[PDB]
Design a protein around this ligand. Sequence first.
Ligand SMILES: Cn1c2ccccc2c2nnc(SCC(=O)Nc3ccc(Oc4ccccn4)cc3)nc21
Ligand SMILES: Cn1c2ccccc2c2nnc(SCC(=O)Nc3ccc(Oc4ccccn4)cc3)nc21
Lengths: 203, 203
Amino acid sequence: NLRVLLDTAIPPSFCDTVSSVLLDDFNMVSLIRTSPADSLATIKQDNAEIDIAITIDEELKISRFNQCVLGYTKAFVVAHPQHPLCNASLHSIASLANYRQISLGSRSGQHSNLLRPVSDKVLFVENFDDMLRLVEAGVGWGIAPHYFVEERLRNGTLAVLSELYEPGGIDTKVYCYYNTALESERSFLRFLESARQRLRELG
Amino acid sequence: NLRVLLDTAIPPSFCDTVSSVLLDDFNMVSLIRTSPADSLATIKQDNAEIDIAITIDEELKISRFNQCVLGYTKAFVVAHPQHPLCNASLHSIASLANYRQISLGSRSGQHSNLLRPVSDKVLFVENFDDMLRLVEAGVGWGIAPHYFVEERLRNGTLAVLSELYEPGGIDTKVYCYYNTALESERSFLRFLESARQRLRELG
Ligand SMILES: Cn1c2ccccc2c2nnc(SCC(=O)Nc3ccc(Oc4ccccn4)cc3)nc21
Ligand SMILES: Cn1c2ccccc2c2nnc(SCC(=O)Nc3ccc(Oc4ccccn4)cc3)nc21
C-alpha cells in the first residue's frame, strides 16, 4: 500500500497523470484529496500514515519527510464582474486588504504564509466550490486554481483582479513531500520523473 | 529623482532593461545594488527613501509599499565537483542540512523564510562572489543566481546539486515593491509593462 495526498489546488488532470504512473510499480495505491490548508497538517499526524503529498503549501523542515518541486500551477484572484474592484488597476491591487476575502480555512486553524488570507475581512470555507459560490454572489473576492475558474471566466460569471499583479495568473510551485524511506528506492525516482514530465509538457 | 534598488540576485541584463525604460519618463534615476538579504531591510528605513525595489525576497505587508511580480529567475545549488554530494541523488538532497552552506548574511542579522539558510552548518557572506570563491574551494555548497554560475559550470569548476529537486534550476519570483504614491501615475504603469515584457521574452 502507498498512500497519497493531492490538495484540491492540484488540477484533476494531474490526478490522472500520477495514478497511471504509480500503478506500474505499485499494487495498492490510495489517493486522498485535501484542502491546501490541511495538506501538511494531515501528513504530520503519524496515524494518517501518508507516503506522498502533492500540495502547493510550503513548510521548511517537516520531520520524517523530504521535499521537491514537481512543477508550477496557476491561480487567479476573482470576483463578481460588478464587484467594486471590477476595474482591476493598481489602487485595487492594494485595496484587496480592505475588501472581504473568501479564503480556505484549516482544521489546524493556523495558515502558512502562502495560504494565510490577505485582508482582515475574511470568510473561511473548506473547498474552492464553497468559495466560488459565495464569490459569484459578489460577497467577496478569492483566489482559486486555474482549472476551477476557466469555465466561469469564459461564461462571463467571474472577473479576474490579478493580472496587473501577475499577468497570466499567479504561478505557484507544486511540492512533493515524500517519506525519507522512498528516497533510495528507484520505484519512486521512476514516478517522480514520469510524473514531472507529463505535468510540465501539459502544464 | 527616482531611487531604485536591484538586489544582486537580479541579472545584470535586467539592469539594462529597466534603466533604458525609466529614462523615457524620468530625468534623474538613481540605481542601487544590494544583497537579496538587505533589500527589504533597506527600503524599510524611511531615510533610505527608496521608490522601487526589484528583489527576490518576500514579506507580506510592508508599510508605505505595494508589491507585484515582474517575473521569475533561476538559481542553482552548487559545489566543488569533488564535493561529497557530487553524486546529486535524493539522499544528497536531504543531506544538505548536514553540510556546510555558504549563505548570504544580512545587516538585519535576520533572514526571511526564502533566504534563511537550510543547514545548521553555515558561513555568512555579503555577495555571491565571496560565496562562490569559498565554494570553489569546496569549503561548502551554496545557491547563487543562474547568471553568476553559467560560466563556471561550463568551465567544469562548479557542479549542480539542485536538479533532482527542481530540474532546470530553481525558479524564484522577482518582486517589484513600489511606493504606493506611484500606483496612480501612468509613468510607472509604463515602466512596469515595458520592463515586464523585455524580462519574460528574454527570461
Ligand atoms: C497563492 N494561492 C494559490 C496558488 C495556486 C492555487 C491556489 C492558491 C491559493 N488558495 N488560497 C490561498 S489563500 C489567499 C492568500 O492568502 N494568498 C494570496 C496570494 C496571492 C494573492 O494575490 C494578490 C493579488 C493582488 C494583490 C495582492 N495579492 C492573494 C492572496 N492562496 C492561494
Ligand atoms: C532561493 N534562493 C534564490 C533564488 C534565486 C536567486 C538567488 C537565490 C538565493 N540566494 N540565497 C539563498 S539563501 C539559501 C536558502 O536558505 N535557500 C535555499 C532555497 C532552496 C534550496 O534548494 C534545495 C535544494 C536541494 C534540497 C533542498 N533545498 C536551498 C537553499 N536562497 C536563494
